[PDB]
Coordinates of C-alpha atoms and ligand atoms in Angstrom, one line a residue:
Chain A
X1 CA -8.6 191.4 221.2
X2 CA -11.6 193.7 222.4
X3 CA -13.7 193.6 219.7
X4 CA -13.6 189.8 220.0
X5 CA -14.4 189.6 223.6
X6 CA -17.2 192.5 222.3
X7 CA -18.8 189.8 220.0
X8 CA -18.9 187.4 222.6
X9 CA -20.4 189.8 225.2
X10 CA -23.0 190.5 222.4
X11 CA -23.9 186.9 222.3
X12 CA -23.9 186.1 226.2
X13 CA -26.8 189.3 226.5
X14 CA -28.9 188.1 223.4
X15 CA -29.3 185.1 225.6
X16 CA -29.9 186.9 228.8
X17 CA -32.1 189.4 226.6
X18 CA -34.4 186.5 225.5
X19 CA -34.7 185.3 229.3
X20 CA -35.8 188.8 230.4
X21 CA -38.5 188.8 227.3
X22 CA -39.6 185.2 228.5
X23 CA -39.9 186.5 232.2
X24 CA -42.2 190.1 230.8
X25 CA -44.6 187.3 229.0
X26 CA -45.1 185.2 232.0
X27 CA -43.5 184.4 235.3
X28 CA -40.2 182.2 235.8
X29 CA -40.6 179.3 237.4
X30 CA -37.8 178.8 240.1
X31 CA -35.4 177.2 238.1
X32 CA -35.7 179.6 234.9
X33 CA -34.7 182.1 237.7
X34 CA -31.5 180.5 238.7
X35 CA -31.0 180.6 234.9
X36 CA -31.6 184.4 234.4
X37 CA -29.2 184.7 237.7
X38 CA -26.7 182.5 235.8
X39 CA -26.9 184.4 232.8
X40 CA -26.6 187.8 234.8
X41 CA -23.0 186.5 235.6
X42 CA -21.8 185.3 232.4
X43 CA -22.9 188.4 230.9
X44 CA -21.3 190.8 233.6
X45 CA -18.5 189.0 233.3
X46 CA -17.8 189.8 229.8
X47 CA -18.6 193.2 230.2
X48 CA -16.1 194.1 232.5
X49 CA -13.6 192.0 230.2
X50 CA -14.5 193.5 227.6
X51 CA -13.8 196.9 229.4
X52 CA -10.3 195.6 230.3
X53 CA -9.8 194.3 227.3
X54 CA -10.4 198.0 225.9
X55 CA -8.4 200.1 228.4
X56 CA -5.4 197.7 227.6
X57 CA -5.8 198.2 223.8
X58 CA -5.7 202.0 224.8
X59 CA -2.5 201.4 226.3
X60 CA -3.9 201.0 230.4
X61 CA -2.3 198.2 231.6
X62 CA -2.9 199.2 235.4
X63 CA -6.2 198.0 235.8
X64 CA -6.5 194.2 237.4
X65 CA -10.2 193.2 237.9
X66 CA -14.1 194.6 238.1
X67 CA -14.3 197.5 240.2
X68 CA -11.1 198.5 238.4
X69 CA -12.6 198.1 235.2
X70 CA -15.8 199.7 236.3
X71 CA -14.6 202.7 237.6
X72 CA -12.3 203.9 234.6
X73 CA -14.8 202.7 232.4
X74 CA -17.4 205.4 234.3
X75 CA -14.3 207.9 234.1
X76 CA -13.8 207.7 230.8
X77 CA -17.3 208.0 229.3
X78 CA -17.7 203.9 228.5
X79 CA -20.8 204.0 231.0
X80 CA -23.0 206.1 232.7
X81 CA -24.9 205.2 235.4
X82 CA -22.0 204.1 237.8
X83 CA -24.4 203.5 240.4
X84 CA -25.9 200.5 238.4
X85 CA -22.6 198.6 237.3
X86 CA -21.3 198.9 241.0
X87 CA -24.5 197.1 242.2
X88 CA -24.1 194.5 239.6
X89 CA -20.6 193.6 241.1
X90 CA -21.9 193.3 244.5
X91 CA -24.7 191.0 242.8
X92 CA -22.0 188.7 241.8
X93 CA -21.1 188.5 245.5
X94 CA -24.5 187.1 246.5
X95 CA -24.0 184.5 243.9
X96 CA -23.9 181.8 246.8
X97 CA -27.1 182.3 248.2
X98 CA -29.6 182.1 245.7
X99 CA -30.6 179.2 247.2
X100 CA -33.0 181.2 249.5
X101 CA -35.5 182.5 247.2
X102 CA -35.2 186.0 248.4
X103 CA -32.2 186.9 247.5
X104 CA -32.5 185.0 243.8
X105 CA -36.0 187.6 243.6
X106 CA -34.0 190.4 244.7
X107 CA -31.5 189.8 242.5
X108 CA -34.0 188.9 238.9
X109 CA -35.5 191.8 240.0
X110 CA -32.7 193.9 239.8
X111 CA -31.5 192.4 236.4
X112 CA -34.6 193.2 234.6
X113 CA -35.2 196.4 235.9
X114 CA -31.7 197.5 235.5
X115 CA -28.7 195.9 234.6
X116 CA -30.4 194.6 230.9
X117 CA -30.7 198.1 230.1
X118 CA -27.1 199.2 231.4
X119 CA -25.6 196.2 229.1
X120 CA -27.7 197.1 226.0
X121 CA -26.2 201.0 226.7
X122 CA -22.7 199.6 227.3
X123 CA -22.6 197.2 223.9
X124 CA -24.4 200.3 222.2
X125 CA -21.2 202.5 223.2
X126 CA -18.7 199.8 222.4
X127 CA -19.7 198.9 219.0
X128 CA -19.5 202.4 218.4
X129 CA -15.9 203.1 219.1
X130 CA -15.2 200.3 216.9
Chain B
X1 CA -21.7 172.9 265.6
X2 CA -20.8 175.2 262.6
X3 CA -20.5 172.5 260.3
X4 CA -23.4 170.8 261.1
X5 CA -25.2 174.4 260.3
X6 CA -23.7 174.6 257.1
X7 CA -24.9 170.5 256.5
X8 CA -28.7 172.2 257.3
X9 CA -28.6 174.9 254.4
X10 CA -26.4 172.3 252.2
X11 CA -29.1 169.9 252.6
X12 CA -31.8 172.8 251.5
X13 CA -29.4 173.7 248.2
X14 CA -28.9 170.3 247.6
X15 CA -33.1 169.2 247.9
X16 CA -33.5 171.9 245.0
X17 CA -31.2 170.8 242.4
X18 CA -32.6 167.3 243.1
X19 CA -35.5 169.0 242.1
X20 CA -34.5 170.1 238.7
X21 CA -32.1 166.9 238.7
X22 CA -34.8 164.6 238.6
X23 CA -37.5 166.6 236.6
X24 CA -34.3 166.5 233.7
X25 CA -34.2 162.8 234.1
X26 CA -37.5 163.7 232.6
X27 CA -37.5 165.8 229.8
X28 CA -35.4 168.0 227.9
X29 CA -34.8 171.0 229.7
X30 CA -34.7 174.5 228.0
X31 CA -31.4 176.8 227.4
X32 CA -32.8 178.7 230.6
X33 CA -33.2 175.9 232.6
X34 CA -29.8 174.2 231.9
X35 CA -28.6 177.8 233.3
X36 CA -30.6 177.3 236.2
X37 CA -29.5 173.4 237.3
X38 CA -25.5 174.9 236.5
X39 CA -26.4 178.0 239.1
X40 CA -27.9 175.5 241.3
X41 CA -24.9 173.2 241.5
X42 CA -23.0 176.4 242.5
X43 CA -24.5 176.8 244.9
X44 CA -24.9 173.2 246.0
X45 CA -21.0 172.3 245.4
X46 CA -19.9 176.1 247.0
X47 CA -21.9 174.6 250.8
X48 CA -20.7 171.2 250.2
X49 CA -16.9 172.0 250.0
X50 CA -17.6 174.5 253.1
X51 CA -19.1 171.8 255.0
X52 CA -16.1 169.7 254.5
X53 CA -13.9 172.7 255.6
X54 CA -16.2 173.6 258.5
X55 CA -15.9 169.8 259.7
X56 CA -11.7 169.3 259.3
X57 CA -11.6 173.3 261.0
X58 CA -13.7 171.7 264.0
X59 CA -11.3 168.3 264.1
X60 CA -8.3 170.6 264.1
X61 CA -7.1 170.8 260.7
X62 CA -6.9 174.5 259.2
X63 CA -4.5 174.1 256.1
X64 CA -7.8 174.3 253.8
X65 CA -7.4 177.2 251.8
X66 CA -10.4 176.5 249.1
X67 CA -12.6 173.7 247.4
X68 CA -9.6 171.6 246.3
X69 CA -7.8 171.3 249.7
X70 CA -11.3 170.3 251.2
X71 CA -12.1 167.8 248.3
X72 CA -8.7 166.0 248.8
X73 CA -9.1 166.0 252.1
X74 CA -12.4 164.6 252.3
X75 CA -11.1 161.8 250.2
X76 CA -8.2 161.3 252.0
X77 CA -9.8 160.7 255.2
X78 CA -12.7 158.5 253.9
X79 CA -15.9 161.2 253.6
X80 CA -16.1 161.1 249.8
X81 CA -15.7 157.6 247.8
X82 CA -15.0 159.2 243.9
X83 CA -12.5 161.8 244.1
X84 CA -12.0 162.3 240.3
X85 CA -16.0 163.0 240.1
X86 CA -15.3 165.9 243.1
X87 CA -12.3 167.3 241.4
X88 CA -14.2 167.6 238.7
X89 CA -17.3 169.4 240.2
X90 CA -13.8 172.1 240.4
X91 CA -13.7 172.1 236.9
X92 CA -17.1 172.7 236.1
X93 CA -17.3 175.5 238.9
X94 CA -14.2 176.9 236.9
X95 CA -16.0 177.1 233.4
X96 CA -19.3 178.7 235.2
X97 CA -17.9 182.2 232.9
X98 CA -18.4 180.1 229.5
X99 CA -21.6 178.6 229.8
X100 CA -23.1 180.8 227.0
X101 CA -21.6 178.2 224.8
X102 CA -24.3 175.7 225.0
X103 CA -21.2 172.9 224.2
X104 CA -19.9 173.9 227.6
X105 CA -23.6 174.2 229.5
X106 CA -24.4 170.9 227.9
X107 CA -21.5 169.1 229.3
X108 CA -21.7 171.0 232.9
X109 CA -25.2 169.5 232.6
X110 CA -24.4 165.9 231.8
X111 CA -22.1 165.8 235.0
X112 CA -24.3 166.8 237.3
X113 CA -26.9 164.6 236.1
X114 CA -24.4 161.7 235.5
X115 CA -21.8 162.1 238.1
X116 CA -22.4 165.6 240.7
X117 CA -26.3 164.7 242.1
X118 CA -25.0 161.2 243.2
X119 CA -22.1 162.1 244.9
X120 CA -24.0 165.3 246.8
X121 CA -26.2 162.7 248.0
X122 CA -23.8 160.5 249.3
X123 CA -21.7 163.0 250.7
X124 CA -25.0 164.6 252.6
X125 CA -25.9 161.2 254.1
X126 CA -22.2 160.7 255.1
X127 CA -22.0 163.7 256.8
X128 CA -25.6 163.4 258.4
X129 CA -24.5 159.5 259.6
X130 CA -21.3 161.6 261.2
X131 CA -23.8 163.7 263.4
X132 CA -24.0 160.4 265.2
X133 CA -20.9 158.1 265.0
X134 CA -17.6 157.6 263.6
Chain C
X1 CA -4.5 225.9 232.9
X2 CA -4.5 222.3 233.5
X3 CA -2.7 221.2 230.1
X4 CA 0.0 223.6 230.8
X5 CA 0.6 222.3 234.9
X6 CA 0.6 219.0 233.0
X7 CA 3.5 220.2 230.5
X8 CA 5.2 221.6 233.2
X9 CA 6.0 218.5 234.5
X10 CA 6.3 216.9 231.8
X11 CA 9.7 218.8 230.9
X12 CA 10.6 217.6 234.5
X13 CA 10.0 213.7 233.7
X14 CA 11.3 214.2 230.5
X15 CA 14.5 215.7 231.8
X16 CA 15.2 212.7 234.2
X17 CA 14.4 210.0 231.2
X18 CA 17.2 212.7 228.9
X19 CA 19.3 211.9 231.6
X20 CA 19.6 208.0 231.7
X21 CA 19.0 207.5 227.9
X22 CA 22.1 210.1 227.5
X23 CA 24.2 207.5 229.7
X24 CA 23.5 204.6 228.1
X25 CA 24.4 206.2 225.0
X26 CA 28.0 206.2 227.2
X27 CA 28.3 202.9 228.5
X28 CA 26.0 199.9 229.4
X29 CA 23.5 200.3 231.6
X30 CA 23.3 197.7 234.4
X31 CA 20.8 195.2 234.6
X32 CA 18.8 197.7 237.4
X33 CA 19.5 201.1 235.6
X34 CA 17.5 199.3 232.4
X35 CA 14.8 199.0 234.4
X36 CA 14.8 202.5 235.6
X37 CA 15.1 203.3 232.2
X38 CA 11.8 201.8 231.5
X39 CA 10.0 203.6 234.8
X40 CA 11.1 206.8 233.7
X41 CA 10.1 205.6 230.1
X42 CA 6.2 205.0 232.2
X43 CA 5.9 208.3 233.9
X44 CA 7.4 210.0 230.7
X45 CA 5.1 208.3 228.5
X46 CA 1.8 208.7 230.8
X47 CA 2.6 212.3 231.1
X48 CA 2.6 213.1 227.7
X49 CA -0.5 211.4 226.3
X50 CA -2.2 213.2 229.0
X51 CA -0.8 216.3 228.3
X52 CA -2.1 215.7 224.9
X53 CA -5.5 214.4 226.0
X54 CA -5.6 217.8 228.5
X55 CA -4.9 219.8 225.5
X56 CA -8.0 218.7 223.3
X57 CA -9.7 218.9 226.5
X58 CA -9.0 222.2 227.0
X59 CA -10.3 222.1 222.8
X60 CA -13.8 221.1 223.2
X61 CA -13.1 217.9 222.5
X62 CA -14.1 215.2 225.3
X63 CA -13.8 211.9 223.2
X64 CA -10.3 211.1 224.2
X65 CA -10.2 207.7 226.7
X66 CA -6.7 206.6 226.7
X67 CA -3.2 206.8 225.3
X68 CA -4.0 205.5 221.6
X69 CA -6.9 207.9 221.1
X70 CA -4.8 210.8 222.4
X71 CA -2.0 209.5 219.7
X72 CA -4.7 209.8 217.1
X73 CA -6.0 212.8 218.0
X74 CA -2.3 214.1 218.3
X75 CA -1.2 212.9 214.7
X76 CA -4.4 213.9 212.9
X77 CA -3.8 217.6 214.3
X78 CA -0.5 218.1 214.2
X79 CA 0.8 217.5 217.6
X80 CA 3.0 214.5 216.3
X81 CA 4.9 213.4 213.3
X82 CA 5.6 209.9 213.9
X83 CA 2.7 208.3 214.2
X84 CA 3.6 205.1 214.4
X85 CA 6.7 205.6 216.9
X86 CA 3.7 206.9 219.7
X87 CA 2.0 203.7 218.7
X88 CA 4.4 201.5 219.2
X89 CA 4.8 203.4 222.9
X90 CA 2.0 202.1 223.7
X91 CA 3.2 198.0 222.8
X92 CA 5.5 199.0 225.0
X93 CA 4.0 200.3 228.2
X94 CA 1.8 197.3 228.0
X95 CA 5.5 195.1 228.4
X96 CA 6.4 196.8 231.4
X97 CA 4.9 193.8 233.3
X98 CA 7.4 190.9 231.6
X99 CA 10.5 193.1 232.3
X100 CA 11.9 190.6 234.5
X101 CA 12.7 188.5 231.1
X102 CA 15.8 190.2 230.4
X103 CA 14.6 190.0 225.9
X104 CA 12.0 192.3 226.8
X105 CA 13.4 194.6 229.2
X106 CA 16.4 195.0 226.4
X107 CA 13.4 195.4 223.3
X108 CA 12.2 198.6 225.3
X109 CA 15.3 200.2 226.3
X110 CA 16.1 200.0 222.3
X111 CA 12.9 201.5 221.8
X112 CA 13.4 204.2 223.8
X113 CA 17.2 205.3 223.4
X114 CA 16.5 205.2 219.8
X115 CA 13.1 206.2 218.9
X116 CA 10.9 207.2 222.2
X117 CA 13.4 210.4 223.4
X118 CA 13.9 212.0 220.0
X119 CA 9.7 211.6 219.7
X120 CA 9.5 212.8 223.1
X121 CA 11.6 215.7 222.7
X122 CA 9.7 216.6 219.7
X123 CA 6.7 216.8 221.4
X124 CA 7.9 219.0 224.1
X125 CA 9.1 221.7 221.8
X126 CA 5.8 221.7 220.0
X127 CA 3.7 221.8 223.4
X128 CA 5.9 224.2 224.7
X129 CA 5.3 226.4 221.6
X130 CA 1.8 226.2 222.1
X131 CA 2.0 227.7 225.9
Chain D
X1 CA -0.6 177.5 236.1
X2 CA -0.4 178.4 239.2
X3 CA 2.8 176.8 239.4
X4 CA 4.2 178.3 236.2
X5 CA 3.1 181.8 237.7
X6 CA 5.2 180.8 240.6
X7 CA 8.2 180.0 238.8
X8 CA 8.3 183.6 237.4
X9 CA 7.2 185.3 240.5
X10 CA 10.9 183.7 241.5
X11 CA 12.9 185.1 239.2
X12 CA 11.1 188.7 239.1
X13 CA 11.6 188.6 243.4
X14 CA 15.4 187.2 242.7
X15 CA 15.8 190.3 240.4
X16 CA 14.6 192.8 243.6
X17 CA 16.2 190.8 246.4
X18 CA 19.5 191.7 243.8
X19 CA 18.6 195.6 244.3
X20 CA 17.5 195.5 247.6
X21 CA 21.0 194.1 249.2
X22 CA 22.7 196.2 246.7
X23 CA 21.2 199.2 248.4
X24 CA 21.8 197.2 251.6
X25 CA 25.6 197.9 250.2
X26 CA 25.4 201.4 249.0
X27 CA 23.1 204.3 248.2
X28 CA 21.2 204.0 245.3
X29 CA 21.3 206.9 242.2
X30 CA 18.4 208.1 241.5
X31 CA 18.0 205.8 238.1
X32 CA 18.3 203.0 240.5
X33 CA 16.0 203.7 242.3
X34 CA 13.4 203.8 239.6
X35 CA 14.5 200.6 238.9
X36 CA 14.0 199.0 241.9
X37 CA 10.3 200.3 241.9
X38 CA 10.0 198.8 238.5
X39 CA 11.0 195.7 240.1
X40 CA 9.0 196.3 242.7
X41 CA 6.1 196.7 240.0
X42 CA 6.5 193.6 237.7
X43 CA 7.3 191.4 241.0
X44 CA 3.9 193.0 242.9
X45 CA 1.9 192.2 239.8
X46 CA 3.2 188.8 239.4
X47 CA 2.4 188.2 243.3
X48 CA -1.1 189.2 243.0
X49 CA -1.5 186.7 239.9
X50 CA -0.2 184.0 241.6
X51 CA -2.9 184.9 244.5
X52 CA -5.6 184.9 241.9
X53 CA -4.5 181.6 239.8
X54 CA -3.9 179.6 243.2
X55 CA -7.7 180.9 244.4
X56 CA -8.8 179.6 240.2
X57 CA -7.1 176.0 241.2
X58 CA -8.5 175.8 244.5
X59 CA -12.2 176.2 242.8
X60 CA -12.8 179.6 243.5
X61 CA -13.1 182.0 240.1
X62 CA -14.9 184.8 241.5
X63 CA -11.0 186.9 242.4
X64 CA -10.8 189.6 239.4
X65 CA -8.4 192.0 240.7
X66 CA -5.4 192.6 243.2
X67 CA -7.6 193.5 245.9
X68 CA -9.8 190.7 246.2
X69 CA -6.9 188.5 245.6
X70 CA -4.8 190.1 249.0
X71 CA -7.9 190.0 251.0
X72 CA -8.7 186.6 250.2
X73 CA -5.1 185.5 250.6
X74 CA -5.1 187.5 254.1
X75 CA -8.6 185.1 254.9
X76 CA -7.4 181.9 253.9
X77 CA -3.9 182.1 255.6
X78 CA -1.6 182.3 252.7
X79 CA -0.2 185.9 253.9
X80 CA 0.1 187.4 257.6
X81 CA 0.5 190.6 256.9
X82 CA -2.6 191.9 254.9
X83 CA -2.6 195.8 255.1
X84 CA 1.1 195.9 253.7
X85 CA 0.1 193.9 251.1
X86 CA -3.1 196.4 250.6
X87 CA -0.4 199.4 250.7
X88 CA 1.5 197.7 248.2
X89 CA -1.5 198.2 245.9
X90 CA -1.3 202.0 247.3
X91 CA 1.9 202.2 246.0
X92 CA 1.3 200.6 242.3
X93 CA -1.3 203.2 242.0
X94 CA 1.4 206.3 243.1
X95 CA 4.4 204.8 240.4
X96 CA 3.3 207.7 237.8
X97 CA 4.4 210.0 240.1
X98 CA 8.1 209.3 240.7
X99 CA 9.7 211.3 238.8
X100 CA 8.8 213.6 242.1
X101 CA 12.3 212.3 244.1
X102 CA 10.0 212.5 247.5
X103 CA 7.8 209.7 245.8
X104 CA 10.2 207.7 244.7
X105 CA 11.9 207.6 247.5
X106 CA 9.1 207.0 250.1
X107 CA 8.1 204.0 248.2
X108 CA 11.6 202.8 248.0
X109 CA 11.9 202.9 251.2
X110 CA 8.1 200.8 251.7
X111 CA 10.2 198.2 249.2
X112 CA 13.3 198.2 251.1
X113 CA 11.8 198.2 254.7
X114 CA 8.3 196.4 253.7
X115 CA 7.6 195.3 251.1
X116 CA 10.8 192.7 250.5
X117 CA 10.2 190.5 253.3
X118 CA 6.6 189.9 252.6
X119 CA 7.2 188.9 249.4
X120 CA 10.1 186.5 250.8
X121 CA 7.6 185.1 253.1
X122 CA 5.0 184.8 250.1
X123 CA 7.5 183.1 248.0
X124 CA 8.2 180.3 250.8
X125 CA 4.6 179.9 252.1
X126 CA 3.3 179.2 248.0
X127 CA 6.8 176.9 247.2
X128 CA 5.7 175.2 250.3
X129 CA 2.4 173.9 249.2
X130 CA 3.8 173.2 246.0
Ligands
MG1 MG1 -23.5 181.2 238.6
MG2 MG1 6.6 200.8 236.2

């Protein structure tokens, strides 16, 4: 069911939501970092379920994994800024190497100044087609 | 040698979750900062199993296809002593997607402060004694 | 007009799945024919919800993002009578991957012979009025 | 499972071996044909699977779709031939379109000529590590 992978997506960004809050009232130490990272993926990852999830309750059965999901989902009107959710995906693939404190900067950087935003426009959408 | 490369950075990864291993042995640590150690063992456990696979690649052996052939592996030929505690480290990598239940983060948590940081530790000094002899 | 290069071929997909549902309503269909049965049932199928979504395209209306939305849209205006027939279409596109188990291949080529073609025919004359 | 995915990747390639050495026999009709890319289809789709939830058992959960699957299984040995297998996915994406006979046909003949084999040789090299 989509609308219960929806519910759980809502949940996963409250979290993340509250990290990004935290991190606009003071900086993140390393760690908290690697935990806004952490919650990046557990959040992107039920968005683009969530998407899949939706397409197949449409009756699209076609579609196997993220980019998949992604681009109908920009297609079809479920996002926007296509740009954004195709940099989250290569995010994911950086996952590794967070470790070097770099790429974990480059990557918080890009969750708060972008992807929170895209999520909270994506469950906006969703919740209202159903 | 590639994997005594992969060792260097593994031993980097590995130094920082000791970090927030040890400082948890302290004190509670926030929902953010139980994210944070679980991204930091992916990170540690993703080097460790390539080190493994780096090292049996170099001594000939190429039938590793992922962390699981390299863990069993690794036991069978002596450089990790608890192979239930490796396999898992697979497990927990596998329920990385779920840790916004904080049931699931608090038990990825417990392992790696009970079980994962030990073993890493181990395994890094095995792998550093094998720089120099059998 | 993009809705009516979409109907066009339509009829032609529609023709071919005429064909093999007309046979089986002669003699069993082999274990392979059933499953061609079923493709023709896809393209049939995936033509003619996006002929409908075309349509309202072609309408004003750009709020249609798959197959079930297009089946709305379809009943509430007219397009179609049985709803519920399109809806259970789309139960049965999303099958098309467990086909290889011989109780589901059979469930959809039911579907079809007795419910999907007569819908499907339906919805040609009615498109086809509209052009 | 992995395993259990296995099993029924079996019996959906046993179904298309059955059409392929039929039309080994004789020509195919043109319902046939459609069948043997449906088998072609539910076989493809189980293969990818079995990629993605052997790559989940090994420790690696990061595969979402069929194209990340048949490159990683190209990388880590488990197929040889990695841009028929990337054609394959081509040819999933071109199935709406057979009820053009020059489609159908072109990617029966991928099946028949292609397509079979690897999927023979995918078969043995997962049964053989169990
Ligand atoms: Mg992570
Ligand atoms: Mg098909």
């Amino acid at each position: 069911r989509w609308q219960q992978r929806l519910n759980n997506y809502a949940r996963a960004l409250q979290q993340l939501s509250l990290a990004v809050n935290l991190a606009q009232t003071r900086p993140l130490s390393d760690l908290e970092k690697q935990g806004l990272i952490q919650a990046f993926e557990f959040t992107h990852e039920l968005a683009w379920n969530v998407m899949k999830d939706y397409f197949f309750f449409q009756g699209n059965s076609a579609i196997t994994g993220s980019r998949d999901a992604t681009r109908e989902s920009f297609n079809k009107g479920l996002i926007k800024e296509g740009e954004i959710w195709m940099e989250m995906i290569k995010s994911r693939n950086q996952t590794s190497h967070t470790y070097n404190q770099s790429v974990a900067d480059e990557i918080v950087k890009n969750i708060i100044n972008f992807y929170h935003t895209s999520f909270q426009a994506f469950l906006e959408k969703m919740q209202g087609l159903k």
